[PDB]
Design a protein around this ligand. Structure first.
Ligand SMILES: [Zn+2]
Lengths: 314, 125, 120, 1049
DNA sequence: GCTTGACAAGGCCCGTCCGTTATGGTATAATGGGAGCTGTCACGGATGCA
DNA sequence: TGCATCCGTGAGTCGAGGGACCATAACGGACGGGCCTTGTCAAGC
RNA sequence: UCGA
């Protein structure tokens, strides 16, 4: 029958597979352990065979090459059988995590990555069941997925342990001090300053959406009240009127005196130049460009032919 | 899309005001990096088939959210704004930002009746 | 500028990557989004691979790159050899488009679920 | 009491609603069965609050209490009882006025009307064919049972999914073939038993699972059907669902309330089959007997139910991972999912609305609103013509007049005056018993719960009765089965108790309601809830008499309770002594801020040494006079057209209303600033701010904050705040300008709180809330300063004034007293209204009101006239003209009444002194002053902020927004020849970062330039269509060149 | 109209220091998910069902 | 090849308001001394 | 929610 729920489709393919017995988990682990030594030989041989060990078979050292491919196909089918049959354990673990940051679809795919890693590190010589050891790896891959994903401005893994450490100490101080909580008692038992605890509370805030309804209806959003990070045209127009008046008092000076003040601060070129680069294009050495600018800035401070540069002080 | 068309600003309280396009872009790359991870370690084919199905649903929800499958949500239980849902509606880019704009050098006030005046003349405070 | 007519067509995969890959004075192009990270939580600066990256879309501030040492108006039109961010204006970020290379093909939802389903 | 749907609902929640939710949640078990957790709900604490009622409004907090229950944690194997009180959640309490305080703002909970749970049948014609009967068994919470009946005798059961046969559900619940046909006519059931097979008890659960969940399992079919209708905590009929099942289907069993009885499903099929045999009643969806209302006691019961279910998942996830003993029961209960469930209902839900506190009439009306919207009600698009009309069962329960016009026309109703809601959620109306043509007005009423339709004959309160003898009239108009008829007075059963029983408490303040139109009475009831409290109110002369009851029930009137002697009265408190710790203090609030920027001032009324009674006014409110309510003033009116100043609903007032402080209100605004924590450096409030001299640093006390009692004007500085900056990106022009005169720029930036445009007043409260003082602060804030500025606003040109009959208008001219017309005694005329708006809108009651108030002006008697009479034509015309003749019998007043023209006198012109040609109707009108003042409508913008994405100007008065030039405004200029005005309004005024700079530079320089560039909104759409996978570009059609144009670059 | 020794000021550059951060691991046994839709009216295609 | 049923598409314009845990190694900004680079002061050519 |  046709259906639209993709979670119902994946749960039907899980239930169509028969579960393994207690003796079949030991049998499949021996071929996976035989696959561990087969890939370790290839990882040791790829450093001296120009990274192309397609026909270099060190395990055999027409009938031996066909039996090597039969053992390689049967060992990869055993790792194919252990992860595929234990997919009901991933659903029983990820159903307790589908409320914090992620949906139910992304948790089974991240939990299946831990089931693959649990199949390689499963040691059947210890005697424990596969469901005991794989629970530690499915829960690890799910918790690492919320620490790395499900947040726009993401936080590191060690920061999630710092927020959980404050929540255990605040609950600890609530039992000793029943009333009147404060923020200085939490920073004393954590051995941290009072300025680092403000950084934890600011980084733990969830981001808000720009298209959320800020009212009781869908008439307005949050983006209608947020300004842009740009300058108003009132400051960009008067910046152009500043050029018409700053160059007016420069044309009344000497042509040598006007050339010093323009190239120094960055006029008519878009780049700021130092005092030594003006002295290398001229035939006059240092201590002249400084006293020319000391003379140019002295005559502009006097109240004579500079009455328009008076109300420009901001 | 360019990043200024999906702006990320910070409010006065310290929270960030993100857009719904950033949450739909992140669902594509997170399911694309998982598909490249499963195809490298020789994953079981029931996991690679399920990973490619969620990659098909992540792009289709990014283009037109709620067209084929179920509408995905975020933190709030409203519908996420996809690429097609910003041009077709009444609050889209056509009917709210192109055919009609908010103009400068404008204002409004209440009106009172002015007698002892003429036509083509209005009272302005 | 001034144009005369607007034409719309189906974007080929060689056309979408034409908007993504941009010429940079190096061996390879860097205009591809590979990570889902947007910015940092400690400082308000983006990362070197992501949806808000400065090596792909341009510098966040005017005449200032991501790593440092180029924060003047003297350097115009050059790319920093240490970081890779072109020192230009901040208005170029709203004109550059990146691309995401997929590992599996995905059908377009407008051609499949549309009316009258031109894919079928 | 007029507020009983809020007080009795929250009282039921504190003793019956909270106990029932905790008893159904307990007990819980683990996966193995080691320990069990059960609560003791009937012994909770409900401890004292933290802050006061007035303190929580200014501290930005909520008037809430902490909830603690005793919890016994027992263990199955080892005998141990761990008794410990665990914190549950924060519950906001209801105040003495019937409201809640959430985040310092007063809020109400609007009562929502929904459908009652039960079985409802409906005859439906899907096409031009046979008659089909449907059914719908609606529960209080759970899945629905929809039984349908097709042609040729086929009854089906639909449980959203595809339909299925009636024998599939009737056999899967557990039944035999002989237990169905004995209580069913069974000849109609043979047509649906032929083409359905004949399943056994186990041959129906498999086929039910194959169509609902498409391998079948014998254990999967039982767990699917039991979880829908037979499982606890997943299906609830409610206390009212069991009552409607035993009434419609006439069942013998009762008091089940938890599980759906399978015998009730057989009775719903039997009632559906008999509808084809022409017996049985088809229910109505718009009937008030099938529509219930719920309130705070019911809406809070659903929020704790969905809050305790989230707590059940954590309580079962902590008793399984921790396999060790010796754990406290206070750590098993996490209050975080239940605190966020109550805070979402009071602050983030749609049904918790912002309280209107303009006058005491709007506060009383907002607590009695009956709205049909909410999470589980209706939708704005799903509302049709039948749900917005008036049902005949609304007679006396819902007010047919008072409803808001516009979008919510009919969806938001109002409760009537004598209406009352019982414990089941149905509206009741009182009625007097009539025995043998005699109204038995001696005992208590009956309070019929809308059961008088098909059984009783009900007469309204308008028939002429005698003094205990009989009824005077021979033909009594009644209503029987939603139809009006006139029968004998000996055949009636009940009669109404009041003529104002139909209208609400706001419509009853309109005198002569029977003479006004129903469309203008709708507007007169809405304008009365918008009248501002004046400085010195005055009681109306033509009042209806119900203003005294609405003032005491508003909660803003101090009443006596002790029957004692008043000792000390001042402007702050009233001290009396109780008699048959004997000195109580009644506090009096002075100029408190309301929600709608009005005042809540209380004035003392009693004197020292006066006997009081329980129920006596000790101190009246702001919009309340002595005893009764007072929303306006009684001043002279004249219905005469002036020289175009009252042309189209305009008002001409005199200058006497200005200098006598008439219609003068006090508005208190509140400003807000906060010293937040910037990551570059902490912000602090200083006085030495840059680039501001002594012109604005006169009212600061060397702390950056203003003092109390300082007159602030537009453009001042209330709180001087600085903000550190780290830009260091100075342009070469500013580096040269600073190097000349010195004065190097500091690292701070002025972010001081300033007064907006058109705002002034006197500062009255400069309360500062900082840390280490005993109050909680939001994170990212060092000092919170709150400034309250009060101003005294007089009546001006442009303000919107109205009366009690819908005669609204805007003042256009204030004339002096020598230019206004004057009466023949020399008294001038205050208002010169226009008589043209009277006969076109049927506003006849406003002419009866002014002509009766003018009779009460010359006599000084303050008439109280109840609406809806008495003898016809002898109670309205001869009452007014008869009392105007008594005022003319005085020896000093002979010009008041005339024999030729009764309701008219001769009025003289004020400018020329000559009398007018025709006599003019004068009188004492009662006008109100609305909240739509001229100060709140002024907005202008040259160049301000811009949008984030489209780079367009924003919109809003409080953020310097621009007016929107929408699509209907483009079509007017496109129909004109204005092509250059259309290109200017779209390019250089909006969405162009380059064109706005050159257009502003052209006006200052004096040389305008043509040819603006490409707007920004088109380039945003170009990049959005390229991200959709569409290769869209712009080209050039020039000679032998087809190249794409770069609009962005 | 210019020129030279002298005195500090400060930006990069290159080492280490320690907070910050990415990565891998833990062995009783544990094995198919929840949360709403059920009161809108009209028109135009698209299946599908005989 | 015509008749039912289901799904997708529309449904007025402006303004105001309020609103799990731990161990270990790699990575990177901060701090400090050394090295030219750059601005400034008093006479003397 | 409220004004036209
Ligand atoms: Zn750089």
């Amino acid at each position: 029958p046709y259906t639209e729920d993709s979670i119902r489709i994946y749960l039907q393919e899980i239930g169509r597979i028969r579960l393994l017995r207690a003796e079949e988990e030991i049998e499949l682990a021996r071929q996976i352990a035989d696959l561990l030594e087969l890939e370790l030989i290839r990882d040791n041989l790829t450093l001296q065979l120009e990274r192309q060990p397609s026909e270099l078979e060190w395990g055999k050292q027409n009938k031996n090459f066909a039996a090597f491919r039969r053992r390689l196909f049967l060992d990869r089918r055993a790792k194919d059988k252990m992860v595929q049959s234990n997919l009901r354990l991933v659903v029983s673990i990820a159903k307790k995590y589908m409320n914090r940051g992620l949906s139910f679809q992304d948790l089974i795919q991240e939990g299946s990555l831990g089931l693959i890693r649990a199949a390689e590190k499963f040691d059947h010589e210890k005697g424990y069941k596969f469901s005991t050891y794989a629970t530690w790896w499915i829960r690890q891959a799910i918790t690492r997925a919320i620490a790395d994903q499900s947040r726009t401005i993401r936080l590191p893994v060690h920061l999630y342990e710092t927020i959980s450490r404050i929540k255990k100490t605040t609950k600890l101080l609530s039992q000793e001090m029943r009333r009147k909580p404060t923020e200085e008692e939490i920073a004393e038992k954590m051995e941290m300053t009072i300025e680092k605890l403000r950084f934890i509370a600011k980084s733990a805030q969830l981001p808000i959406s720009l298209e959320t309804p800020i009212g009781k209806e869908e008439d307005s959003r949050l983006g209608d009240f947020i300004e842009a990070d740009g300058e108003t045209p009132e400051d960009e127009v008067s910046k152009n009127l500043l050029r018409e008046d700053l160059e007016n008092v420069l044309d009344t000076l000497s042509p040598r005196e006007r050339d010093v003040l323009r190239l120094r601060y960055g006029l008519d070129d878009g780049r700021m130049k130092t005092l030594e680069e003006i002295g290398q294009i001229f035939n006059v050495t240092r201590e002249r460009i400084r006293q020319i600018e000391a003379k140019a800035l002295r005559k502009l401070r006097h109240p004579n032919r500079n009455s328009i540069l008076k109300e420009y002080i901001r | 899309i360019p990043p200024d068309l999906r702006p990320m600003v910070q409010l006065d309280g310290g929270r960030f005001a993100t857009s719904d396009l950033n949450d739909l872009y992140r669902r594509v790359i997170n399911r694309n990096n998982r598909l490249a991870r499963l195809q490298e370690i020789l994953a079981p084919e029931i996991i690679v088939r399920n990973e490619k199905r969620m990659l098909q649903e992540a792009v289709d929800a990014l283009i037109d959210n709620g067209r084929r499958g179920r509408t995905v949500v975020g933190a709030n239980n409203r519908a996420l704004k996809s690429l097609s849902d910003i041009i077709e509606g009444k609050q889209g880019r056509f009917r709210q930002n192109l055919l009609g704009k908010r103009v400068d050098y404008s204002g409004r006030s209440v009106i009172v009746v002015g007698p002892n005046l003429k036509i083509y003349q209005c009272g302005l405070p | 500028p001034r144009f005369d007519y607007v034409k719309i067509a189906i974007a080929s995969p060689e056309r979408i990557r034409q908007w993504g890959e941009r010429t940079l004075p190096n061996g390879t192009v860097v205009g591809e989004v590979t990570k889902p990270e947007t910015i940092n939580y400690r400082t308000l600066k983006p990362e070197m691979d992501g949806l808000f990256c400065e090596k792909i879309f341009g510098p966040s501030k005017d005449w200032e790159c991501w790593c440092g040492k180029y924060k003047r108006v003297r350097h115009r039109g050059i790319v920093c050899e240490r970081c890779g961010v072109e020192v230009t204006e901040s208005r170029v970020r709203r004109h550059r488009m990146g691309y995401i290379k997929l590992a599996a093909p995905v059908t377009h939802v407008w051609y499949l679920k549309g009316i009258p389903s031109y894919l079928s | 009491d007029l507020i009983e749907i809020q007080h009795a609902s929250f009282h039921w929640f504190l003793e019956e609603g909270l106990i029932e939710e905790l008893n159904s949640f307990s007990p819980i078990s683990d996966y193995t069965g080691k320990l069990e957790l059960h609560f003791l709900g009937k012994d909770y604490k409900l401890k004292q609050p933290k802050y006061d009622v007035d303190e929580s409004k200014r501290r930005d907090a909520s008037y809430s209490v902490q909830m603690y229950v005793p919890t016994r944690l027992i263990n199955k194997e080892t005998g141990e009882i761990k008794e410990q009180e665990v914190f549950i959640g924060d519950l906001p309490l209801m105040t003495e006025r019937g409201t809640f305080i959430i985040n310092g703002a007063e809020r109400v909970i609007v009562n929502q009307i929904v459908r009652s749970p039960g079985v409802y049948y409906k005859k439906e014609l899907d096409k031009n064919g046979r008659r089909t009967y449907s059914a719908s068994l609606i529960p209080n919470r759970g899945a629905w049972l929809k039984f349908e009946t097709d042609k040729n005798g086929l009854v089906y059961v639909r449980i959203k999914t595809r339909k299925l046969s009636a024998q599939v559900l009737l056999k899967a619940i557990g039944l035999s073939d002989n237990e169905i046909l004995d209580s069913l006519h069974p000849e109609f059931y043979q047509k649906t038993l032929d083409k359905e097979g004949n399943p056994t008890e186990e041959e129906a659960l498999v086929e039910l699972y194959k169509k609902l969940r498409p391998p079948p399992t014998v254990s999967g079919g039982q767990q699917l059907l039991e979880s829908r209708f037979f499982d606890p905590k997943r299906y609830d009929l409610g206390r009212v669902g069991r009552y409607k099942l035993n009434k419609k289907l006439r069942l013998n069993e009762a008091d089940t309330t938890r599980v759906l009885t399978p015998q009730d499903i057989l009775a719903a099929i039997n009632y559906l089959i008999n509808l084809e045999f022409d017996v049985g009643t088809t229910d109505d969806i718009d009937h008030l007997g099938n529509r219930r209302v719920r309130s705070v006691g019911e809406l809070l019961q659903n929020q704790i139910r969905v809050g305790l279910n989230r707590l059940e998942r954590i309580i079962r996830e902590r008793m399984t991972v921790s396999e060790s003993d010796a754990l406290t029961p206070a750590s098993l209960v996490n209050p975080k999912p239940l605190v966020a469930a109550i805070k979402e209902f009071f602050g983030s839900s749609q049904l918790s609305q912002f309280m209107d506190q303009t006058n005491p009439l709007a506060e009383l009306t907002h607590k009695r609103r009956i709205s049909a919207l909410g999470p589980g009600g209706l939708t704005r698009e799903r509302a049709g013509f039948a749900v917005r009309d008036i049902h005949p069962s609304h007679h006396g329960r819902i007010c047919p007049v008072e409803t808001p016009e516009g979008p919510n026309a009919g969806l938001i109703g109002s409760l009537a005056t004598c209406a009352r809601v019982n414990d089941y959620g149905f509206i009741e109306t009182p009625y007097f018993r009539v025995e043998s043509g005699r109204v038995r007005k001696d005992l208590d009423p009956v309070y019929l719960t809308a059961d008088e339709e098909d059984d009783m004959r009900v007469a309204p309160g308008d028939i002429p009765t005698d003094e205990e003898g009989n009824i005077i009239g021979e033909s009594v108009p009644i209503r029987y089965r939603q139809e009006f008829s006139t029968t004998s007075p000996e055949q009636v059963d009940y009669v109404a108790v009041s003529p104002v029983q139909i209208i609400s408490v706001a419509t009853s303040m309109i005198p002569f309601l029977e003479h006004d139109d129903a469309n203008r009475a709708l507007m007169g009831s809405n304008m009365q809830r918008q009248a501002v409290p004046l400085l010195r109110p005055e009681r109306p002369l033509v009042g209806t008499g119900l203003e005294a009851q609405a003032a005491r029930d508003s909660g803003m009137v101090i009443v006596s309770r002790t029957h004692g002697i008043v000792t000390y009265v001042d402007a702050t408190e009233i001290r009396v002594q109780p008699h048959s710790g004997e000195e109580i203090v009644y506090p009096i609030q002075k100029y408190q801020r309301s929600n709608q920027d009005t005042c809540l001032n209380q004035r003392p009324l009693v004197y020292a040494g006066e006997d009081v009674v329980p129920g006596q006014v000790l101190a009246d409110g702001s919009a309340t006079e002595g005893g009764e309510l007072a929303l306006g003033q009684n001043i002279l009116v004249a219905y005469m057209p002036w020289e175009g100043y009252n042309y189209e609903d305009a008002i001409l007032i005199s200058e006497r209303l200005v200098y006598d402080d008439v219609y003068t209100s006090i508005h208190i605004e509140k400003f807000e600033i906060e010293a937040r924590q910037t990551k570059l450096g902490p912000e602090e409030i200083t006085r030495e701010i840059p680039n501001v001299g002594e012109d604005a640093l006169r009212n600061l006390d060397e702390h950056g904050i203003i003092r109390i009692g300082a007159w602030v004007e537009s453009g001042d500085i209330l709180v001087g705040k600085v903000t550190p900056k780290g830009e260091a990106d100075q342009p070469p022009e500013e580096k040269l300008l600073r190097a000349i005169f010195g004065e190097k720029a500091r690292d701070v930036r002025d972010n001081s709180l300033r007064v907006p445009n058109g705002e002034k007043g006197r500062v009255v409260d400069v309360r500062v809330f900082t840390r280490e003082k005993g109050d909680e602060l939001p994170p990212g804030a060092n000092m919170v300063v709150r400034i309250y500025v009060a101003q005294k606003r007089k009546i001006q040109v442009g303000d919107k004034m109205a009366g009690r009959h819908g005669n609204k208008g805007i003042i256009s001219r204030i004339l002096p007293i020598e230019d206004m017309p004057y009466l023949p005694d020399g008294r001038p005329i205050d208002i010169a209204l226009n008589p043209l708006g009277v006969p076109s809108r049927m506003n006849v009651g406003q002419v009866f009101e002014c002509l009766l108030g003018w009779a009460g002006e010359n006599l000084g008697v303050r008439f109280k006239i109840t609406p809806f009479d008495m003898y016809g034509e002898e109670a309205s015309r001869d009452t007014v003209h008869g009392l105007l003749e008594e005022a003319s019998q005085r020896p000093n007043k002979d010009w008041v009444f005339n024999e030729n023209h009764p309701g008219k006198i001769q009025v003289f012109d004020g400018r020329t002194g000559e009398p007018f040609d025709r006599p003019i109707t004068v009188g004492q009108a009662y006008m109100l002053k609305l909240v739509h003042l001229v100060d709140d409508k002024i907005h202008a913008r040259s160049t301000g902020p811009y949008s984030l994405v489209t780079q367009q100007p924003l919109g809003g008065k409080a953020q310097q927004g621009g007016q929107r030039f929408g699509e209907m405004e483009v079509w007017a200029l496109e129909a004109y020849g204005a092509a250059y005005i259309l290109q200017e309004l779209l390019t250089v005024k909006s969405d162009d970062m380059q064109g706005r700079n050159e257009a502003l530079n052209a006006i200052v320089k004096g040389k305008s330039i043509p040819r603006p560039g490409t707007p920004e909104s088109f380039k945003v759409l170009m990049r959005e269509l390229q991200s959709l996978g569409l290769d869209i570009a712009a080209h050039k059609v020039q000679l032998s060149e087809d190249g794409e144009s770069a609009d962005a670059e």
